[PDB]
Design a protein around this nucleic acid. Structure first.
Ligand SMILES: [K+]
Ligand SMILES: [K+]
Ligand SMILES: [K+]
Ligand SMILES: [K+]
Ligand SMILES: [K+]
Ligand SMILES: [K+]
Ligand SMILES: [K+]
Ligand SMILES: [K+]
Ligand SMILES: [K+]
Ligand SMILES: [Mg+2]
Ligand SMILES: [Mg+2]
Ligand SMILES: [Mg+2]
Ligand SMILES: [Mg+2]
Ligand SMILES: [Mg+2]
Ligand SMILES: [Mg+2]
Ligand SMILES: [Mg+2]
Ligand SMILES: [Mg+2]
Ligand SMILES: [Mg+2]
Ligand SMILES: [Mg+2]
Ligand SMILES: [Mg+2]
Ligand SMILES: [Mg+2]
Ligand SMILES: [Mg+2]
Ligand SMILES: [Mg+2]
Ligand SMILES: [Mg+2]
Ligand SMILES: [Mg+2]
Ligand SMILES: [Mg+2]
Ligand SMILES: [Mg+2]
Ligand SMILES: [Mg+2]
Ligand SMILES: [Mg+2]
Ligand SMILES: [Mg+2]
Ligand SMILES: [Mg+2]
Ligand SMILES: [Mg+2]
Ligand SMILES: [Mg+2]
Ligand SMILES: [Mg+2]
Ligand SMILES: [Mg+2]
Ligand SMILES: [Mg+2]
Ligand SMILES: [Mg+2]
Ligand SMILES: [Mg+2]
Ligand SMILES: [Mg+2]
Ligand SMILES: [Mg+2]
Ligand SMILES: [Mg+2]
Ligand SMILES: [Mg+2]
Ligand SMILES: [Mg+2]
Ligand SMILES: [Mg+2]
Ligand SMILES: [Mg+2]
Ligand SMILES: [Mg+2]
Ligand SMILES: [Mg+2]
Ligand SMILES: [Mg+2]
Ligand SMILES: [Mg+2]
Ligand SMILES: [Mg+2]
Ligand SMILES: [Mg+2]
Ligand SMILES: [Mg+2]
Ligand SMILES: [Mg+2]
Ligand SMILES: [Mg+2]
Ligand SMILES: [Mg+2]
Ligand SMILES: [Mg+2]
Ligand SMILES: [Mg+2]
Ligand SMILES: [Mg+2]
Ligand SMILES: [Mg+2]
Ligand SMILES: [Mg+2]
Lengths: 152, 145, 118, 221, 100, 110, 50
RNA sequence: CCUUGCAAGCUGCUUUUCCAAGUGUCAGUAGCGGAACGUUCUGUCAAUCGGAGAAGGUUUUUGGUGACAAGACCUGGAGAU
RNA sequence: CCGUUCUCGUUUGUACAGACAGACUUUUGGGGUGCUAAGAUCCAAAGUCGAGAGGGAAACAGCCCAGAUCGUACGCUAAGGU
RNA sequence: UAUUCCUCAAUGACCGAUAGCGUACAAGUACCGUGAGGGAAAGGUGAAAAGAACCCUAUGACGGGAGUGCAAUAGAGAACCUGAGAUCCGAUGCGAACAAUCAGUCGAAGGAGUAGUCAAGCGCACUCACUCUAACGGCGUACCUUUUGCAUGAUGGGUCAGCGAGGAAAUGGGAAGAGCGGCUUAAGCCAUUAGGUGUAGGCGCUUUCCAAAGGUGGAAUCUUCUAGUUCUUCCUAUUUGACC
């Protein structure tokens, strides 16, 4: 039995849950109308989910709103605290320029850049050095904090 | 051990130890009777009788028993009535078997309601052989030559 | 025991050394069977190998009745319980108990008749 | 004995088909000493067998059973049960309602779970003492009698799986194909179900090196 | 009758504690009274609970007073004592019939 | 319940009810319902029989059943009705002694 | 209790007030009267040590 | 089944079992949840059983809460899992 | 605000419902309509049936008593009886 | 890249004679229809025909013997392996023409057939022995469906055997279990006694208000906490014939 792996003796952690087979006998508890009750559309299976009974539904009583700007630009937000945490770990060289390639390679940006990067002010107290950034957008507080530490 | 003795006394029996092959306790019939209480049930027995009781938890096969709750004694000439028991009277017995009875089916059904249940049950019983009744004078041997 | 005479004479332990359904009876043979053999000197216990078959216990009695209890896929304590119930039985047929007080002498003083005077 | 699952490197003897002494090899502990888990092996074996199933099983619906769509008699008046065809699911010779149709039975499994299952299988073989490492798998001839002689020489074995690093040489291929109890695989085809079908595992040094190199390379993503 | 067992064998006076015994069944009664009996701890017929004698308990008893027997500590103790004294062992009776 | 078990339980049934599964299943289920009910009802019937035999035994000596059984209760004699009826049938002199004891315990009115 | 006895096709028979029914009513009255006496005796003050 | 203890492992120093008590609970349609039995087929299985008679069929007996299981005689004549 | 119950039956998240044909009894002494009729009909407040077996009401959905885990040829009671 | 009137080779947790093609058998036949058209049923002696010489009784051997054969109810002439049930005719035991009712159930007199055990004297009383029957007593108005409610004089079923309805895919809402710690690939590609690869994409990190432009300091101070994702099983939903 010590370190045996027989096909004879394999199983999962918990026992397998089996399918509920309706329309079998009385003792199963789901025979004779299964779990459908008596008559109507729902017992005969001709009911569409979301129908509300002929009342004007909420999806048609509320107004439509606005328009969609097809040319909306999406920028990835990065807080200064994430950049500080990656600076202290040696992933980012704080003496060189921090571009969007630098943030993309260390994983501060996720998988898909869309239109660029917006630098944010979350965790800005952890910025203690002059840092130079080249991003697409930047908030007012993040630029204020970075220039207060001698960067740009 | 003393707790089992106390509980068996509550039921109404005392274990005296195993039956030895040297003993001849199964004597011919004597015309006295006793009424004994074992659990809820009462039995009117003479020697050589057999009774099936509810399962006795603290005895084994071929154990000699003393039945401690004797309610009445009788013979051809006198009757001794206990209020409720007779402490001076003893009835001796031997455990013969612990066996399950025949299965009874428990069936329930509610018509037109799609409900039914079927289950079984077997009750365990203890068989005792009554060997000796004490506390009332037995008739003398009338050796009719 | 009927009037002090033990009724079960032979306990046959039928088992398989290969089959998975004989695991419990094999553990019973190793663990609980010597104790039962020791506590019953009046009982003969034979053990029989039956490869490819499901295990059972067989009880042969004084009245030439044989009772077989299949013990396939049982835990060892259930096998020991079945062996104990075979030992404690008188070997009778499993039918309904017609009475709980068997007597051949129902009356010491004579059954009531219309001729009885007080 | 030893505690399996500590991720410790192991030292194994190296031999060949001639029962010679070819030194020793170190087996990487993150491949041959992982904790042994039955549930992962259960899922990997189920994944392999589900991928294997052909699924060429079929029945006919009422659109495919031969028979007319005509109503067999009038809805009312004949005293008989109403039917739309004579090919309904309750009819003899009729359609099969909810019957099988040809489909794939394959399920999905993460790649890392498959790698872990292969690690567990190799660890169990090394832990039982049923893993033999060969310096190479070269045979003098293609005759099956050499393999049969080595198999008879072996100790407490029934079915052997022989793993080669690269593609299998023609001599071993010809020598083992008539034997149901000796089966061969390149290291690219090593799988959990093939390992568990044989109680003894024979791997060359190249096969061990290729498996450890594969497990030490992360999944490219 | 069944109330004959519960008749007072002691004068009824002020008590420190009260014993309440449910002597009526639950179906066919108001759900409020059943919830009150549940708040007294009485769920099954012929069951007895023991409570301190204050107005919060007394109002609950007053609501369901036709379903229960309420006893003082002294009445309950006397009833149990008389029941134990009745079942106590007495000396045997010997009757010699004989001579038909 | 299987078809073979139903045919086992339908043994001795009259007509097609022992033989055909549609007919046998109803009659066997009704038989099992009767068996469940009659395990309860047997105790009522047997207590009625014991009380009838005790009442016949005690009225031979001029004592009604209720006065007799209450006089036995008053003396802490705890023999039950089954054993008392067996005494009334098979040990009439001991039963007469019990009737005398109960009549001294509780004569009743009249 | 049902009190409709001379109308309709569903028979609710009138339960006659026999002496035995009067005896049961008197027993129930004795029980409630003893309960009321206990509540009157115990209602003068509350039990201490709360 | 639950609750309260008890004693064991754990890792969780707290979640799981064994045992003991329980004047604790256990009618049930629609319906919801939990735990199982059996059938066919596949791997385990070039393994195991089979003229020392397979499958299937009739009797009979024993076991489990149940779906059901199992022993033996007879029939059967090559398969069963 | 304070007792009793020690039960979470409370509130709420998530997932799965079924049901939206009710019936009778409580002085016609909670009332409307009807004829102070209906086994009518429509509301209020209880209970039972529905979905509830057992004992009583001759027989009995809805009244009275009372809630069926199983076994016993043990005991005490309810309604109702002797 | 599409398709199969076709050929060759191979495979199947596909079916196994009411299944699988309508057809395992001379089937698009027989049969039905003016016609278009509709459309079956029916497999199995035995290893080998050794397929039963001859006798007896019948008009006549399929019978009773004999013989063949492992086996003859293995004895057939589009059918004989096994040989269930409904159904029909008999044999034995008990009940049965003075007593009524879902045909039972709980008790039970009697009748009939049949075993074994053994201390003491080779009988006899023990195993409530066992099996079948059941005079007589108490209790007992089928089942299913549908209903406020059915013994209902509401529905359905002559009986038996076989068959007969919650099922598949993809995509969502969840639960349980697991892998990894950012997770996971799709088509494809290289191999298949078998896996390995493949980053395009998807979700998360991620920033909350807002129609859009615009705008965006989480919690904590005492070595700081600061994200999920992909599978498997099951319950449900959508689109599909969607329980029949
Ligand atoms: K048509
Ligand atoms: K069919
Ligand atoms: K056909
Ligand atoms: K044959
Ligand atoms: K035949
Ligand atoms: K009868
Ligand atoms: K009609
Ligand atoms: K899903
Ligand atoms: K996870
Ligand atoms: Mg249900
Ligand atoms: Mg049905
Ligand atoms: Mg439902
Ligand atoms: Mg319906
Ligand atoms: Mg509905
Ligand atoms: Mg069509
Ligand atoms: Mg048409
Ligand atoms: Mg078909
Ligand atoms: Mg009427
Ligand atoms: Mg009526
Ligand atoms: Mg009067
Ligand atoms: Mg009364
Ligand atoms: Mg329930
Ligand atoms: Mg057979
Ligand atoms: Mg088969
Ligand atoms: Mg199988
Ligand atoms: Mg509506
Ligand atoms: Mg409505
Ligand atoms: Mg409706
Ligand atoms: Mg309404
Ligand atoms: Mg009203
Ligand atoms: Mg009105
Ligand atoms: Mg009215
Ligand atoms: Mg009405
Ligand atoms: Mg109406
Ligand atoms: Mg209401
Ligand atoms: Mg309804
Ligand atoms: Mg209810
Ligand atoms: Mg009722
Ligand atoms: Mg009645
Ligand atoms: Mg009633
Ligand atoms: Mg209950
Ligand atoms: Mg056919
Ligand atoms: Mg066939
Ligand atoms: Mg066909
Ligand atoms: Mg011939
Ligand atoms: Mg053959
Ligand atoms: Mg044949
Ligand atoms: Mg037949
Ligand atoms: Mg006959
Ligand atoms: Mg006559
Ligand atoms: Mg008639
Ligand atoms: Mg009977
Ligand atoms: Mg009757
Ligand atoms: Mg109607
Ligand atoms: Mg009715
Ligand atoms: Mg009808
Ligand atoms: Mg009707
Ligand atoms: Mg009809
Ligand atoms: Mg059928
Ligand atoms: Mg791929």
């Amino acid at each position: 039995a010590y370190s045996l792996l027989s096909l004879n003796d394999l199983r999962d952690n918990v026992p397998r849950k089996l399918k509920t087979r309706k329309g079998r006998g009385i003792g199963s508890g789901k025979g004779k109308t299964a779990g459908r009750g008596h008559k109507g559309q729902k017992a005969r299976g001709t009911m569409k989910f979301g129908f509300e009974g002929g009342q004007t539904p909420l999806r048609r009583r509320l107004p439509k709103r606005g328009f969609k700007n097809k040319f909306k630009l999406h920028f990835q937000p990065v807080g200064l605290g994430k950049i500080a945490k990656l600076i202290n770990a040696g992933q980012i060289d704080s003496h060189e320029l921090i571009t969007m390639k630098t943030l993309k390679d260390v994983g501060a940006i996720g998988k898909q850049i869309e239109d660029g990067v917006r630098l944010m002010g979350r965790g800005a107290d952890e910025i203690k050095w002059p840092l130079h950034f080249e991003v697409s957008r930047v908030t007012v507080r993040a630029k204020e904090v970075v220039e207060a530490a001698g960067g740009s | 051990p003393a707790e089992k003795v106390e509980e068996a006394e509550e039921i109404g029996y005392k274990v005296m130890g195993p039956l030895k092959p040297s003993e001849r306790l199964f004597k011919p019939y004597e015309p006295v009777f006793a009424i004994v209480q074992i659990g809820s049930h009462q039995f009117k027995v003479s020697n050589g009788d057999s009774i099936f009781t509810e399962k006795l938890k603290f005895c084994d096969i071929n154990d000699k028993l003393v039945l401690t709750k004797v309610l009445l004694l009788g013979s051809a000439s006198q009757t001794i009535i206990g209020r409720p028991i007779l402490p001076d009277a003893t009835v001796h017995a031997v455990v013969e078997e612990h066996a399950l009875d025949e299965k009874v089916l428990i069936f329930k059904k509610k018509r037109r309601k799609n409900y039914r249940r079927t289950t079984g049950h077997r009750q365990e019983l203890t068989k005792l052989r009554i060997t000796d009744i004490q506390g009332i004078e037995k008739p003398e041997p009338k050796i009719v030559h | 025991a009927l009037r002090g005479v033990w009724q079960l004479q032979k306990l046959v332990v039928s088992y398989c050394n290969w089959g998975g359904s004989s695991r419990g009876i094999r553990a019973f043979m190793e663990s609980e069977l010597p104790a039962l053999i020791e506590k019953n000197p009046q009982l003969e216990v034979v053990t029989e190998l039956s490869r490819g078959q499901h295990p059972y216990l067989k009880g042969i009695y004084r009245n030439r009745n044989e009772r077989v209890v299949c013990v396939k896929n049982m835990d060892p304590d259930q096998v020991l319980l079945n062996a104990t119930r075979l030992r404690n039985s008188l070997g009778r047929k499993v039918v309904k108990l017609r009475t709980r007080h068997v007597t051949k002498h129902p009356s010491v003083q004579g059954t009531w008749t219309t001729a009885v005077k007080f | 004995d030893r505690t399996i699952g500590q991720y410790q490197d192991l030292v194994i003897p190296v031999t060949n088909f001639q029962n010679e002494d070819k030194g020793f090899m170190v087996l990487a502990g993150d491949v041959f000493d992982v904790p042994v888990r039955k549930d992962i092996i259960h899922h990997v074996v189920r994944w392999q067998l589900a991928k294997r199933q052909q699924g060429t099983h079929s029945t006919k619906t009422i659109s495919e059973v031969s028979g007319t769509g005509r109503k067999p008699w009038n809805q009312k008046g004949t005293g008989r049960a109403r039917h739309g065809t004579l090919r309904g699911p309750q009819f003899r010779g009729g359609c099969v309602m909810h019957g099988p149709r040809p489909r794939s039975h394959a399920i999905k499994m993460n790649k890392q779970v498959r790698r872990l299952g292969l690690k567990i299988a190799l660890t169990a073989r090394a832990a039982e003492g049923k893993l033999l490492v060969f310096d190479d798998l070269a045979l003098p001839t293609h005759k099956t009698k050499n393999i049969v002689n080595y198999y008879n020489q072996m100790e407490t074995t029934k079915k052997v799986l022989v793993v080669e690093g690269g593609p299998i040489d023609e001599k071993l291929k010809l020598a083992t194909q008539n034997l149901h109890y000796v089966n061969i695989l390149p290291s690219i085809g090593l799988n959990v179900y093939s390992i568990l079908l044989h109680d003894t595992l024979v791997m060359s040094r190249d096969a061990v090196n290729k498996i450890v190199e594969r497990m030490h390379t992360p999944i490219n993503r | 009758s069944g109330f004959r067992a519960f008749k007072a064998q002691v004068p009824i006076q002020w008590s420190e504690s009260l014993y309440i015994t449910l002597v009526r069944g639950l179906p066919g009664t108001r759900k409020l009274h059943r919830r009150t009996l549940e708040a007294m701890g009485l769920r099954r017929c012929h069951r007895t609970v023991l409570h301190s004698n204050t107005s919060s308990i007394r109002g609950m008893i007053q609501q369901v007073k036709r379903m229960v027997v309420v006893e003082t500590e002294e009445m309950f103790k006397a009833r149990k004592e008389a029941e134990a004294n009745h079942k106590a062992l007495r000396p045997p009776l010997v009757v010699s019939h004989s001579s038909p | 319940m299987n078809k073979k078990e139903i045919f086992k339980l339908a043994k001795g049934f009259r007509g097609r009810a022992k033989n055909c599964i549609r007919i046998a299943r109803e009659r066997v289920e009704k038989a099992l319902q009767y068996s469940y009910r009659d395990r309860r009802n047997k105790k009522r019937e047997m207590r009625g029989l014991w009380i009838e035999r005790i009442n016949a035994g005690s009225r031979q000596h001029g004592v009604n059943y209720g006065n007799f059984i209450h006089g036995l209760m008053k003396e802490n004699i705890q023999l039950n009705r089954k054993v008392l009826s067996e005494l009334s049938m098979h040990e009439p002199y001991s039963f007469k002694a019990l009737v005398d004891v109960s009549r001294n315990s509780f004569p009743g009115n009249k | 209790i049902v009190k409709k006895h001379d109308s309709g096709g569903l028979i609710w028979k009138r339960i006659k007030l026999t002496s035995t029914r009067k005896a049961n009513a008197k027993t129930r009255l004795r029980r409630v009267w003893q309960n009321e006496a206990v509540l009157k005796a115990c209602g003068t003050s509350d039990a201490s040590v709360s």
